[PDB]
């Protein structure tokens, strides 16, 4: 059959780049408009980065630095965002569905922190 | 001079096309098949004209021993009596009597039974 669990519409290398790229964008911007699916897939990965950063020690930073290649974003996540989510029992990131696009007819969506 | 087709064909074509009234698909729409269908219809038309003449006699014969048997007779037997009573030359519309007027039909069954026995 196919009872696995994850997505991949590209190849290993790329599936990672995308997740890391959208993870960097959401943390840079605070909210990003993307395809509904790409947004559904992004949600767990960014939520996981917030928890790693919630450590607040060097090891926790360097672990974020593995997926967040932008130096300024890693500082923002580490010193600004994770602290704010201290008492949030890791949940925050929400998805809003906008509606169908022109060229491909794809339903767009929002993903905000 | 030059004698072009213009009108002659279209008139002949529309004629055949109009014979094809409630013909299915292309048979009522395209000339070649419309005309083609009509050749076969021709066979059917000439045949069925003299075929209906067999069909009705059979319907009539059927209604006859239907009534003849109702009074304990049959077609073979009932018609033989009506033949023996020469006087009876009914033959045609002997089925209307059997269908519409039972009382009157009995009279003929009774008359046939006599001329026979």
């Amino acid at each position: 059959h196919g009872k696995a669990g994850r997505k991949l519409n590209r190849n290993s290398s790329a599936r990672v780049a995308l997740a890391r790229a959208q993870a960097t964008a959401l943390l840079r911007e605070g909210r990003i408009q993307t395809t509904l699916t790409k947004a559904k897939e992004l949600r767990p990965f960014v939520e996981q980065l917030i928890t790693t950063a919630k450590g607040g020690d060097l090891h926790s930073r360097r672990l974020v630095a593995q997926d967040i290649h932008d130096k300024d974003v890693v500082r923002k996540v580490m010193d600004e965002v994770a602290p704010k989510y201290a008492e949030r029992p890791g949940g925050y990131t929400r998805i809003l569905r906008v509606g169908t696009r022109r060229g491909d007819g794809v339903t767009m969506a929002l993903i905000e922190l | 001079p030059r004698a072009k087709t213009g009108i002659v064909r279209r008139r002949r074509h529309k004629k055949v096309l109009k014979r094809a009234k409630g013909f299915w698909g292309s048979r009522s729409k395209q000339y070649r098949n419309a005309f083609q269908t009509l050749l076969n219809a021709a066979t059917y038309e000439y045949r069925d004209r003299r075929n209906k003449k067999r069909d009705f006699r059979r319907l009539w014969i059927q209604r006859i021993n239907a009534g003849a048997r109702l009074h304990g007779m049959n077609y073979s037997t009932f018609i033989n009596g009506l033949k023996r009573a020469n006087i009876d030359l009914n033959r045609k519309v002997l089925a209307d009597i059997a269908a519409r007027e039972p009382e009157a039909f009995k009279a003929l069954v009774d008359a046939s039974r006599n001329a026979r026995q």
Binding site: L96, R97, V98, G99, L110 | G25
Partner: protein, 58 residues
Amino acid sequence: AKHPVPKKKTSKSKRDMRRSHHALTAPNLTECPQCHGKKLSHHICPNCGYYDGRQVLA
């Protein structure tokens, strides 16, 4: 040449018969609570940009 090929033209009937399932389904449009311009269920209202509060610009 072009290996399997159709044997006869498919009639005006036959062709249209397979078309019986092509008819589009109109959206289930709902009236918007705070600008009334119709919206899709579970989507942000295109006119006011609301989804309980106003989420999107314009």
